[PDB]
From a paper:
In this study, we investigate AfuABC (Actinobacillus ferric uptake ABC), a BPDT originally identified as an iron-specific transporter in Actinobacillus pleuropneumoniae, a Gram-negative upper respiratory tract pathogen. The locus afuABC encodes 3 polypeptides corresponding to a conventional BPDT–AfuA (a periplasmic binding protein or PBP), AfuB (an inner membrane permease), and AfuC (a cytosolic ATPase). AfuA is a class II/cluster D periplasmic binding protein with two globular α/β domains linked by a dual β-stranded hinge. Instead, AfuABC is a trio of proteins that bind and transport sugar-phosphates such as glucose-6-phosphate (G6P).
To gain insight into the mechanism of ligand capture by this PBP, a structure of apo (open)-AfuA was solved to 1.6Å. The globular domains of apo-AfuA are held at a 29.7° angle relative to the closed form. The binding pocket of AfuA contains both electropositive and electronegative regions, corresponding to the regions of the pocket that bound the phosphate or sugar moiety of G6P respectively. We propose a two-step mechanism for ligand capture by AfuA. Substrates such as G6P or F6P first dock to the protein via hydrogen bonding to residues in the electronegative region of the binding cleft. Next, the negatively charged phosphate group of the ligand serves as the target of a simultaneous rotation and closure of the two globular domains of AfuA, generating a stable AfuA-ligand complex. This cinching mechanism is driven by the electrostatic attraction of the Arg/Lys-rich regions of the binding pocket (which also includes residues such as Ser37 and Thr150).
Numbering used by the authors: 1 to 318
Write the structure that this text describes.
């Protein structure tokens, strides 16, 4: 049935498994080239007069939205969009499904229950505001917003949850309980897993992997609500293999295509297709208390710079 070239921005393992599973189902000779979302965006833009791939799969949706704005993508609404929550059906800036959401990374925190059992604390924290408990002094970690996008997602989430003023009040009250602002977004997951801290804040699928490997972690989607990142799929405008690109978007949005991502592809993000079985270490998306994250507003470089600078000035250095 021909061939398909994928620019993949997910992991190598997830990409390889998607290519193999797609090729098996549809008998399309499928290959991928893996690169980060930013590098991939630059490549697609550079190659726009003679595109070298058919589809862009995985990684954050925001750069795919920006490519849609620049006329680099081909709009196509898969019938499987019917199986995605209205909220996530057409999430990018230019409407018409130039891009679609294939998974979601949920911001939350996880608690080391063994270490909790040593702090004299009997109940597992279930809310963001539980983390200001003075019993948790020196027992929480989150990444440094200056060096980590994960921590910036936290800032933007709190700002959308409570307004910017109360978000920074919350950071001020959380601050005395933070033992380390880590350089990397994922470090609090490794540290909470090993008992180097009690609570780590970050993307829940990272804590899930530590739990999979045996760490005594309880994952929490905080009670007040929370934010997230989305994974995207998009067809390139001028794709050499447009028919097969549409089949691949169908597949990436399908029950089987999304299930295989965690069943064999080692991905632990929550799936956007509401008919899909979730990993036992992921979540039931329709039941989650999620803000509607405004990526257009908070993804702008000037707003991001401003909010990080405010965090530095008022939290880190005040
Ligand atoms: Cl099922």
């Amino acid at each position: 049935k021909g061939r398909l070239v994928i620019y993949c921005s997910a992991t190598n393992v997830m990409c390889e498994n998607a290519a193999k599973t797609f090729e098996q189902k549809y008998d399309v000779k499928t290959s991928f080239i893996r690169n980060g979302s930013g590098s991939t965006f630059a490549k697609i833009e550079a190659e726009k007069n003679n595109p070298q791939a058919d589809v862009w799969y995985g990684g954050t949706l925001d750069p795919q939205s920006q490519a849609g704005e620049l006329g680099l993508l081909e709009a196509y609404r898969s019938p499987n969009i019917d199986q995605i929550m209205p909220k996530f059906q057409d999430p990018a800036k230019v409407k018409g499904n130039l891009s679609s959401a294939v998974y979601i990374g949920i911001l939350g925190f996880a608690v080391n229950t063994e270490r909790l059992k040593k702090l004299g604390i009997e109940k597992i924290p279930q809310c963001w505001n539980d983390l200001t408990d003075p019993k948790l002094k020196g027992e929480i970690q989150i990444a440094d917003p200056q060096s980590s996008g994960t921590a910036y997602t936290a800032i933007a989430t709190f700002a959308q949850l409570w307004g910017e003023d109360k978000a920074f009040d919350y950071f001020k009250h959380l601050h005395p309980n933070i033992s380390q602002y880590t350089k990397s977004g994922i470090t609090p997951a490794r540290n909470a897993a090993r008992g180097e801290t009690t609570v780590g804040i970050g993307f829940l699928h990272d804590y899930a992997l530590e739990k999979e490997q045996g760490a005594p972690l309880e994952m929490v989607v905080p009670c007040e609500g929370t934010g997230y990142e989305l994974g995207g799929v998009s067809i390139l405008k001028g794709a050499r293999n447009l028919d097969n690109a549409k089949l691949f978007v169908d597949f990436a949005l399908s029950k089987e295509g999304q299930e295989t991502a965690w069943k064999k592809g080692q991905a632990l993000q929550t799936l956007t297709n509401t008919t899909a079985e979730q990993s036992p270490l992921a979540f039931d998306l329709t039941k989650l208390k999620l803000i509607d994250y405004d990526f257009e507003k908070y993804g702008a470089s000037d707003e991001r710079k401003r909010l990080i600078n405010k965090w530095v000035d008022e939290i880190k250095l005040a």
